[PDB]
Amino acid sequence: VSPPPPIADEPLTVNTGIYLIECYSLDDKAETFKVNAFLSLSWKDRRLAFDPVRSGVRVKTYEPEAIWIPEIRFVNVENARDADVVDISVSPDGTVQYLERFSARVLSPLDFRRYPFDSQTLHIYLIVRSVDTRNIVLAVDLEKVGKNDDVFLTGWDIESFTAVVKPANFALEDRLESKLDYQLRISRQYFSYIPNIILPMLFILFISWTAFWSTSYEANVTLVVSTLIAHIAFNILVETNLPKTPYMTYTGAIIFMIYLFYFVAVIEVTVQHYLKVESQPARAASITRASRIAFPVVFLLANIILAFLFF
Amino acid sequence: VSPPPPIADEPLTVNTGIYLIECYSLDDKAETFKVNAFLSLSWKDRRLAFDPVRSGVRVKTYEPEAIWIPEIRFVNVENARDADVVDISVSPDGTVQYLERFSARVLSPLDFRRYPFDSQTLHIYLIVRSVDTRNIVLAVDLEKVGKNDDVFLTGWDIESFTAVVKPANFALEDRLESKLDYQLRISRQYFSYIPNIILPMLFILFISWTAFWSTSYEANVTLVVSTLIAHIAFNILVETNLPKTPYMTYTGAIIFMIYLFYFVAVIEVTVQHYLKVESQPARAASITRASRIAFPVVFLLANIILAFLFF
Amino acid sequence: VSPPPPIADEPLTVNTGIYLIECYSLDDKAETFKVNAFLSLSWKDRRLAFDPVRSGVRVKTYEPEAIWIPEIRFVNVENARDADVVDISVSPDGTVQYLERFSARVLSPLDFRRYPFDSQTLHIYLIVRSVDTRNIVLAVDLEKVGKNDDVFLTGWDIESFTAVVKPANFALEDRLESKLDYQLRISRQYFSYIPNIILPMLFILFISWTAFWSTSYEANVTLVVSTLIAHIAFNILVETNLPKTPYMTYTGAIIFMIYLFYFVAVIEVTVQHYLKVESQPARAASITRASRIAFPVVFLLANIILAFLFF
Amino acid sequence: VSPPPPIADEPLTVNTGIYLIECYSLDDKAETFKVNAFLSLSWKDRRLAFDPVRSGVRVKTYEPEAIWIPEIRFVNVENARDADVVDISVSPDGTVQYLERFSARVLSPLDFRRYPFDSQTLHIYLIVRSVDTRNIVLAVDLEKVGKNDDVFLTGWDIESFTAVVKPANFALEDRLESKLDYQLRISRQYFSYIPNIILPMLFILFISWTAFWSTSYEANVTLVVSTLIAHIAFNILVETNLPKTPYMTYTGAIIFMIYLFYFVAVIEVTVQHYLKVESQPARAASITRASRIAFPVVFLLANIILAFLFF
Amino acid sequence: VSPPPPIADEPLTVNTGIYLIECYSLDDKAETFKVNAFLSLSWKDRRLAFDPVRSGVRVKTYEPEAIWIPEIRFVNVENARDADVVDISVSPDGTVQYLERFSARVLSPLDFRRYPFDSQTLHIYLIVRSVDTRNIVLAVDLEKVGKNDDVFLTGWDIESFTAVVKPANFALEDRLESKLDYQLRISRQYFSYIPNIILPMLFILFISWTAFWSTSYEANVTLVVSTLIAHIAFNILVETNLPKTPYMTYTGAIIFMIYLFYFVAVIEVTVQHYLKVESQPARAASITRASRIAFPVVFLLANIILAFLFF
Ligand SMILES: CCCCCCCCCCCCCCO[C@@H]1O[C@H](CO)[C@@H](O[C@H]2O[C@H](CO)[C@@H](O)[C@H](O)[C@H]2O)[C@H](O)[C@H]1O
Ligand SMILES: CCCCCCCCCCCCCCO[C@@H]1O[C@H](CO)[C@@H](O[C@H]2O[C@H](CO)[C@@H](O)[C@H](O)[C@H]2O)[C@H](O)[C@H]1O
Ligand SMILES: CCCCCCCCCCCCCCO[C@@H]1O[C@H](CO)[C@@H](O[C@H]2O[C@H](CO)[C@@H](O)[C@H](O)[C@H]2O)[C@H](O)[C@H]1O
Ligand SMILES: CCCCCCCCCCCCCCO[C@@H]1O[C@H](CO)[C@@H](O[C@H]2O[C@H](CO)[C@@H](O)[C@H](O)[C@H]2O)[C@H](O)[C@H]1O
Ligand SMILES: CCCCCCCCCCCCCCO[C@@H]1O[C@H](CO)[C@@H](O[C@H]2O[C@H](CO)[C@@H](O)[C@H](O)[C@H]2O)[C@H](O)[C@H]1O
Ligand SMILES: CN[C@@]1(c2ccccc2Cl)CCCCC1=O
Ligand SMILES: CN[C@@]1(c2ccccc2Cl)CCCCC1=O
Ligand SMILES: CN[C@@]1(c2ccccc2Cl)CCCCC1=O
Ligand SMILES: CN[C@@]1(c2ccccc2Cl)CCCCC1=O
Ligand SMILES: CN[C@@]1(c2ccccc2Cl)CCCCC1=O
C-alpha cells in the first residue's frame, strides 16, 4: 500500500477501459443517466513481479487490500459509485489487471434546442490524482472499451461509445490530475412525439380555423377560446417533461407561436363581429375571406422559417 | 479462497436455482420489476471432502469466508443485489450447497404494441466470470427452480417461471463468461382499462355524434369541442402511464384515430352551417343524414381493421 | 455458533412475539405498509445453563455473536428488515430471551371491492428455516404480542393485532420451514370520501338534471356536457388513488354508472330538441316530463341494487 | 460494557438534553418532520472515577466501545436515527457526559381542524429500557435543551421547544421503560393561503352571482357551471395538500358549503327561466331580486357561523 | 488519537478549503441543493514531525485511523455527508494536509420576493467543536477554495464562491464552537418564464379585453369566464413550483392582481348588459368605450407600480 516507485522519474500510466452493461433512466429534467458497467485498470508495479518457473503459476491473484491500487474516481457523478471488485490478476513482469463492476448516476448536461429532434453527447469523466512520490496518468486501452448489444436506453437510440484517447492533465490544488473523456452518443426517438403532442396540437389549431367559415360570434368565440385552452394543456404537458432552459427550444417556439395565431384569430373574429353589428357584412366578409388563406399560409410559412433557424 | 482446481482440465459446473418469494412493482415507464427470491448454488470442491465415519457428521457447515464461493452476479439489475446468506452445507464428497435470499430491482424491457392486452416475458440473467485457473460454467437444477403460490404481481397474471437450461457462453474482455436466462412470463390484467379508460372514451365520442341530429351550430360546436377536450384528458392520462415507445401502441392508435373522427365531425358541423346560412338546408340535411350512419360505420369499420393489424 | 443439539430428536421450538410501536404509510396503490416493532424470541439452549449460587447472578447477558441465535426472517417484506438488538438474557436453565427492535416495509395485498367502505387484514409472516442437525419450529407467546395505544395508522381504524397460534410447516427446497401468521386488522375511515368525492359528484349530477326543466338545447348541451367533464375529473382523481384491480370496486361501479346517466340525458336532451324543430313540443314535453321523475327514480333505484350486490 | 451497579438499589438516572440544529420537511400528508439535533446524555458510573492529582487530568476521554452507554432510543421515528458520536468526557467522580449529533424522521400526528389557521404540538419521545441488573430512568437537564436561532421550519412559525420534566414510567414486556416527552410547538403561516386559495375561490363565487342581474339562461348557465368547475379545481388542489382526516377541516367545510351555494344558484337560475318561458317575468324578477341580497347575506351569515364552531 | 497538545495554551487552528466539483438539484420548494466537493483540512500536529535526511522521505503518508483528525462537521445538511478520504500527507514539521471528497444535501433558505427575477446566496457552514484539552478554531485557506469551470447548476447562473474569512466563535453546550461561512452566489435564469408563463398569461388576459368591443353578453361572459379559468391554471402551475412564503412574491402579486382585472371586467360586462336590457345602449356604450382604454392603461399603470415596490 504505497505507489510503485519510478525506475527513473517517469509518470505511472494507468490503462483504463469502460464496458457498459446497462444504460437507463435518462432523466431530461435532471440531466442525469444511470450506468452499470465494467471498469478495467492496468498498470505496472514491478515489486509484484515473479518467476513462472519457480512460482509455478503463469499468473497470480491478489485481494484489493493486498496491493496498491490507483485511486481512480468519476468526476461527474452524484455519489461515489458503488463498486464491486471482480478480479485482480498479476502477471510475472508485475503488470496488474484490475476489474470492477460499478454503477453510478452520471450528471452530464443536454442540449434541448432541437427537442424533440435532438441528439446528445453524454460524458463519463475518469480522473486520477497524482500522489506525492510520483505522477499518475490515465490512458485508454481501446481493446477494453465497449458496450454490449442489449444496452437499451429507453426512448433513445445509441450511436456510439468511445473515449478521447488524450487525457487532459492539469493542476488542481497542489497536485496534478489526469482526466479522461468517455463519450456516449445518443439521438432521441422522435416518433412518439408525433401522435402524442405535435399532431393533436395542430388538429385543435385547425379546428380553430373553421371560425373563418362562420359568421356566428357566439360560436367563433367558443371555438377559438375552447381550443386555446386545449393548447394551453399541451403547452403545460410539454414544459413539465423539460428542464427550464435559458435558450429557446424548437417545440417551445412552435408552441409559443401558436399562441399568436390564437390571439390574432380572436382579433379577426372580433373585428368581423364589430363590422356586422354596424351593418358592414361586406367589409367583414372580405377580411374573413382573406383569413381563410392568410392563416394557413402564414403558418406553413413561419414554421418553415423556424425549422430553418433551428436545423 | 481460491478456485477448486481440476482433476484434469474440465470446466467447473455451478448448478443454479431461483425460487421467487415475491414479485412486485412492475413499473411500465421504467420497465423494471423488483424481485425477492432464493438463489441456490451447487458445485464440487474436492478439497472439502471428508469421512462420515471418522468425522461423525453426515454433512458439515461453513461460513462464506471459510470456503471459496463462485462470484455469481445478475446481469440486468440496477444495483448489485442485496444478499443474505442463509446456509452453506458441504457433503462428504466435497459437494457444496449454497443458499442465499436476495432482493434486486431487475431491468427487463417490455413490448407495449398490444397494450393493454399485452403479455410480457421478464428476464433475470445469472452470469459468472471464469477465473485464471479454470473455466466456470452455469447450469440449471430444475428441482430448485420455482415460485410460491402467493407471488402476486399487482395488476398482472403470472403464467410461468422457467429457465433456459442451456447457458450462453462467450468471451467478455479476456475471460469467458457463462450466462443463464431465467424467464418470468406474465400477461396484463386488461379488465380495469375497460370501465376506466376505454368505455368513457367511447361514450364522450358518441355524445359528440348527437350533433348529427341537430341543426344548431352554436350547440354542435359546444358538443364537439367540449368532448374533444375530455378526450385530450384521457389521452394525456394514458400517455403518462406509459414509456415513450418508438412504435405505435394499440391504445395509442385507437386514441389517435378518434382525434380524426373529431376533426371530421367539426368539418361536417361547419359545412352544414355554411349551407344553412346560404339557404341550403336541403344539401346540409342530406349530408347530416349520411353522417348519422357513415361515422358509426366507418368507426366500427376502422377499429376492426386496427385490431386486425395488431392481433 | 451451531444449533443446540436435541437431548433426543425433538424439534427446537422458538417462541415469537411482535409488539407494534408504529404503523404508518399504508399505500393503497403499492399495497404496502411500514411497521416499527419489537420482535421477541425465546428458546432453550442447554449448553448455556449455569448455577445461580456459584455464578452468583440470577441471569446472564450475551452479545449476539457470542451465542447461536435462530435465523428468523420475514416472508413478505420489501427488503431484509433493519434490526437493532436490544437485549439477550439467558436464565440458569439455558432459556434465551432475545429482543430486537425492527422496522420493515411489509407487502400484504388489499381487497378494494367495497372501497372506500372496506376493511383489510394485514399480514406479517415470520418464517424460520430448519438446519441440517435439527428442525426448528415457531410458536406464539401471546403474552408478548401486542401494540401500544398510540399506534395510529393515518386514515384507518385499527381493530386488532393477533397471531394464528398454529404455524404452517412445510418443505421448501430440501429443508423444512416454519411460518407464523401475524394479523393486523383495520377498517378504512370512510368519512372524508363523503364531502370530498361522493357528494360533489352527486351535486354535479343533479345540476345536470335541471335540463329536464328546460327547453333550450343550446343550454342543456352546456349543462350536461360541462358537468360530464367535472365528473370525468372526479373519476380520474379517484383512479389515481387506487391500484388497477381486475375486479370492480364499489366507487368504481357508481362512478361508471353515472356515465350512463349522462349519456342517456344527452340522448333525451337531443330527442327533445329534434321534436321541437319538427314542431312537436307536445311529444317532447311528455318525454321531458317523465325524465324529471324517471332519472332520479332509476338512479336511487340502481344505487340500491349496487349496494346490495356489494354489501 | 455492563451497567454500573447500584451502591444500594437506586435506579440509575440518565440526564437527557436535546438541542435542535435543524427542523425541516414538515409533510402534512405523512404527518412527519425531519430533525437534526444534539442529543446529550449524562449519568454516574463510579467504576470510571479517578484522581485528578495522580492521573494529572481534570477529565478523561473514552471511545463509545470502551465504556457502558445507556441504550437510549426514540419512540416515534421512521427508522433508527443516524447518530454520530461527538464526545465522551468522564469527570473524576465517574460522571459521564455523552454527546451525539443525530438526524431522524419523526412521526407525530397533526390536528387539521383549524387548517390553515392551525397550530401543532410536535412530539419527540426519548425512551430507555431497564436492564436486568438495574432500573434506568430518564430526566431532563433543562440547561441542555434548546434550539438555535436559525432553525427555520419552512412555512411555519416556531413558538417553543421544551420537555415535560416528569418521565412516564411503565412496564413493557417484562422490563420497565422510561419515556420523555420533548415538545416542539408551531403555528402555521396562514398568509399565502389567502391570495393563493381563499380569495380566488371567493372571486369565482362572486363572479357566479352576477347571474342574478341577468335574464339570459343561455348565459347564466355558462357563468354558474363554468365557475363551479373552477371551484372543483381549487377543491382538488386543497385536498391533495392534506391527509384524509375523519373529521371536518375548516377549509373543507368552507369549500363544501360553497358547493351548496352553486347548486342553489343553479336552481334559482332554472326557476327564473321556467317562469320567463311560461310568461311570468314578474314572479321571476321578484325572486331574482331577492337572490341578489339573500345569497351574499346568507353566505356572510353562514361563514360567521362556521368560524364560530371552529374557533 | 488524541488532540495535539499546545506548546503553551494557543488554540489549534484548522485551515479549511472547499472546491466544488458539482452543484445540482436546487429544489425551490424544499430550499435545498446537492453539492459534490473537495474538503481540504490542514493543521500542525508536532508529534508527527520527522527528519527528511534520516527518514529519507520529504513527506509521509498516514491512514485516517493512524492519526488524530479534527471532527469537522457541516451545520446545515440533511444527513452527515458521505465522505471518502482521498489523501493524508504529513510534512516534516508535523503539518497535516487532509483531503476528502464529499457529497451532501445542503439546506439553505431562499428569498422568493423577486421571483423569477431573484438572486440567492447559498450557504455551506463548516463547524468544529472544541475538545476538553484545547480549543479548535477554523480558518480559510483561500488558495484551496474554488469551483471548476463546468459546475453547472441547471436553471441558474453561478456568480461566485467565496468564504467569509472570519469564523464565528461561540459557546454551544459547555464547549466552544468555530463556524465558517462558505457562500455560493447565484442568480436565476429568468428567460424560460417569459414564453412559458408570463406572456401566455398576458395573451389570455388581452383576449378577455375584446369583450369591450362587443355587445353580446352571451359571448362576453364566455370570453371572460373561459380565460379566467385558463388563468387559474397558470396560477396553480406557478404555485406548485414554489414553497409557501409568508411574504408576497412578484409573480404572485402580478398573478393575483390579474384576478381583479377579471372581476372588474365581469362587472363591466354585466353593467353593460343591464343597461341594454333597460334600453340604454347610450350609457352602456359610453362605459364600454372607456373600458377599452381604462383597462390597458390602469394595467400598464399598476404593473409599473408593482415593479417599483419590488425592485
Ligand atoms: C384539454 C384541456 C384539459 C386537458 C385535461 C388533461 C388532464 C391531465 C390529468 C392527468 C393526471 C394523471 C396524473 C398521474 O397519473 C398517474 O397517477 C398514479 C398515482 O400515484 C401514478 O402512480 C405511479 O407512480 C410512478 C410515477 O409517478 C409509477 O411509475 C408507478 O409505477 C406508479 O405507482 C402513475 O404513475 C401516474 O402516471
Ligand atoms: C371539470 C374538470 C375539473 C378540473 C379541475 C382539476 C384541477 C386539479 C389540479 C391539481 C394540482 C395538482 C398538483 C398539486 O401541487 C403539488 O405538487 C407537488 C409536487 O410538485 C406535491 O408535493 C408534495 O408531495 C407529497 C405528496 O405526495 C407531500 O407530502 C410533500 O410534502 C409535497 O412536497 C404536492 O403534494 C401537490 O399538492
Ligand atoms: C376537461 C378535462 C377533463 C378532466 C380534467 C382533469 C381531471 C384530473 C385531475 C386529477 C389531478 C390529480 C391530483 C393529484 O394526484 C394525487 O395527489 C396526492 C397528493 O400529492 C397523491 O398522494 C400520493 O403521493 C404518491 C403519488 O405518486 C403516492 O404513491 C402516495 O401513496 C400518496 O401519498 C395521490 O396518490 C395522487 O393520486
Ligand atoms: C383552462 C386552463 C388550462 C387547463 C388545462 C391545463 C392542464 C395541463 C395538464 C398537466 C398534465 C401533467 C401531468 C404530469 O405528467 C407527467 O407525470 C409523470 C408521472 O410520474 C412524470 O414521470 C416522470 O417524473 C419525473 C419528474 O420529476 C421524471 O424525471 C421521471 O423520469 C418520469 O418517470 C412526468 O415527468 C410528467 O411529465
Ligand atoms: C378550471 C379548472 C382549473 C384549470 C386547470 C387547473 C390547473 C392544472 C395544471 C396543474 C399541473 C401542474 C404540474 C405539476 O407537475 C410538475 O412536475 C414536474 C416534474 O414532472 C415538477 O418538477 C419538480 O418537482 C419537484 C417538486 O415540485 C421540484 O422541487 C423539483 O426540483 C423538480 O424536478 C414540477 O415542480 C411540478 O410542478
Ligand atoms: C448482447 N450482450 C451480451 C452481453 C455482454 C456483457 C454482459 C452481458 C451480456 Cl447478455 C450478450 C451475450 C453475447 C455477449 C454480449 O455482447
Ligand atoms: C404459497 N407459498 C408458500 C410459501 C413458500 C415459500 C416461502 C413462503 C411461503 Cl408463505 C406458502 C406455504 C406453503 C408453501 C408455499 O408454497
Ligand atoms: C400508549 N403507548 C405506550 C408506549 C408503549 C411502547 C412504546 C412507547 C409507548 Cl409511548 C405509552 C406509555 C404507556 C405504555 C404504552 O402502551
Ligand atoms: C443562531 N444559531 C447559532 C448556531 C447554533 C448551533 C449550531 C449552529 C449555529 Cl449557526 C448561530 C451562531 C450563534 C449560536 C447560535 O445560536
Ligand atoms: C473545468 N473543470 C476542470 C475540472 C476540475 C476538477 C475536477 C474535474 C474537472 Cl473536469 C476541467 C479540466 C481543467 C481543470 C478544471 O477546472
Short mmCIF file of all heavy atoms in Angstrom, two decimals, chain C residues 277-292:
data_model
loop_
_atom_site.label_atom_id
_atom_site.label_comp_id
_atom_site.label_asym_id
_atom_site.label_seq_id
_atom_site.Cartn_x
_atom_site.Cartn_y
_atom_site.Cartn_z
N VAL C 277 -87.89 21.01 -33.21
CA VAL C 277 -87.53 21.56 -34.51
C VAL C 277 -88.52 21.10 -35.59
O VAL C 277 -88.74 21.81 -36.58
CB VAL C 277 -86.08 21.21 -34.89
CG1 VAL C 277 -86.02 19.93 -35.73
CG2 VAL C 277 -85.43 22.38 -35.63
N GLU C 278 -89.10 19.92 -35.38
CA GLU C 278 -90.09 19.35 -36.28
C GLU C 278 -91.47 19.81 -35.88
O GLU C 278 -92.48 19.32 -36.40
CB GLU C 278 -90.09 17.83 -36.17
CG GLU C 278 -89.08 17.10 -37.03
CD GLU C 278 -89.26 15.59 -36.90
OE1 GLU C 278 -89.95 15.17 -35.93
OE2 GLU C 278 -88.74 14.85 -37.77
N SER C 279 -91.51 20.74 -34.93
CA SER C 279 -92.76 21.22 -34.36
C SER C 279 -93.50 20.05 -33.73
O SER C 279 -94.37 19.46 -34.36
CB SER C 279 -93.62 21.89 -35.44
OG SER C 279 -92.86 22.87 -36.14
N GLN C 280 -93.12 19.71 -32.50
CA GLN C 280 -93.77 18.65 -31.76
C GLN C 280 -93.69 18.87 -30.26
O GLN C 280 -93.70 17.91 -29.51
CB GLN C 280 -93.10 17.31 -32.05
CG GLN C 280 -93.09 16.92 -33.50
CD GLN C 280 -94.40 16.33 -33.91
OE1 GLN C 280 -95.31 16.19 -33.09
NE2 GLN C 280 -94.52 15.99 -35.19
N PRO C 281 -93.61 20.15 -29.83
CA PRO C 281 -93.36 20.41 -28.40
C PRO C 281 -94.22 19.55 -27.48
O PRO C 281 -93.94 19.44 -26.29
CB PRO C 281 -93.72 21.90 -28.25
CG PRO C 281 -93.51 22.48 -29.62
CD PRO C 281 -93.89 21.39 -30.58
N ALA C 282 -95.28 18.96 -28.04
CA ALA C 282 -96.17 18.08 -27.30
C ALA C 282 -95.46 16.79 -26.90
O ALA C 282 -95.35 16.49 -25.72
CB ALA C 282 -97.39 17.76 -28.14
N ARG C 283 -94.99 16.04 -27.89
CA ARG C 283 -94.28 14.78 -27.64
C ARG C 283 -93.06 15.05 -26.76
O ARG C 283 -92.84 14.39 -25.74
CB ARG C 283 -93.83 14.12 -28.95
CG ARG C 283 -94.83 13.15 -29.58
CD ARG C 283 -95.42 12.18 -28.56
NE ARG C 283 -94.41 11.37 -27.87
CZ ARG C 283 -94.68 10.46 -26.94
NH1 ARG C 283 -95.94 10.23 -26.58
NH2 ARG C 283 -93.69 9.77 -26.38
N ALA C 284 -92.26 16.03 -27.17
CA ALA C 284 -91.10 16.43 -26.41
C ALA C 284 -91.47 16.55 -24.94
O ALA C 284 -90.98 15.78 -24.11
CB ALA C 284 -90.57 17.75 -26.94
N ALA C 285 -92.34 17.50 -24.64
CA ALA C 285 -92.70 17.84 -23.26
C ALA C 285 -93.24 16.67 -22.44
O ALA C 285 -93.23 16.71 -21.21
CB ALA C 285 -93.69 18.99 -23.24
N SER C 286 -93.73 15.63 -23.11
CA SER C 286 -94.26 14.48 -22.39
C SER C 286 -93.10 13.56 -22.00
O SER C 286 -93.11 12.97 -20.91
CB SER C 286 -95.31 13.74 -23.22
OG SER C 286 -94.71 13.06 -24.31
N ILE C 287 -92.11 13.46 -22.89
CA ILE C 287 -90.86 12.79 -22.57
C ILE C 287 -90.11 13.54 -21.47
O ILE C 287 -89.89 13.01 -20.38
CB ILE C 287 -89.98 12.70 -23.81
CG1 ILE C 287 -90.57 11.68 -24.78
CG2 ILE C 287 -88.56 12.29 -23.40
CD1 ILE C 287 -89.78 11.53 -26.08
N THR C 288 -89.74 14.79 -21.75
CA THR C 288 -89.14 15.67 -20.75
C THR C 288 -89.85 15.59 -19.39
O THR C 288 -89.23 15.73 -18.34
CB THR C 288 -89.12 17.14 -21.24
OG1 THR C 288 -88.75 17.18 -22.62
CG2 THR C 288 -88.13 17.97 -20.43
N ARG C 289 -91.16 15.38 -19.41
CA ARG C 289 -91.92 15.39 -18.17
C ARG C 289 -91.65 14.12 -17.38
O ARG C 289 -91.62 14.12 -16.15
CB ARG C 289 -93.42 15.57 -18.45
CG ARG C 289 -94.27 15.86 -17.23
CD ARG C 289 -95.63 16.44 -17.60
NE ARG C 289 -95.52 17.78 -18.17
CZ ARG C 289 -95.85 18.10 -19.42
NH1 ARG C 289 -96.33 17.16 -20.25
NH2 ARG C 289 -95.71 19.36 -19.83
N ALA C 290 -91.45 13.03 -18.11
CA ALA C 290 -91.18 11.73 -17.49
C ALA C 290 -89.76 11.71 -16.94
O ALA C 290 -89.54 11.32 -15.80
CB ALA C 290 -91.40 10.59 -18.49
N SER C 291 -88.81 12.12 -17.77
CA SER C 291 -87.42 12.21 -17.36
C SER C 291 -87.29 12.81 -15.95
O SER C 291 -86.61 12.24 -15.11
CB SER C 291 -86.63 13.04 -18.37
OG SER C 291 -86.75 12.49 -19.67
N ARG C 292 -87.95 13.93 -15.71
CA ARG C 292 -87.90 14.60 -14.41
C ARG C 292 -88.16 13.66 -13.24
O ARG C 292 -87.80 13.98 -12.10
CB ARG C 292 -88.94 15.72 -14.34
CG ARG C 292 -88.74 16.80 -15.37
CD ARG C 292 -89.94 17.71 -15.39
NE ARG C 292 -89.81 18.71 -16.44
CZ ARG C 292 -90.68 19.69 -16.62
NH1 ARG C 292 -91.72 19.79 -15.81
NH2 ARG C 292 -90.50 20.57 -17.60
#
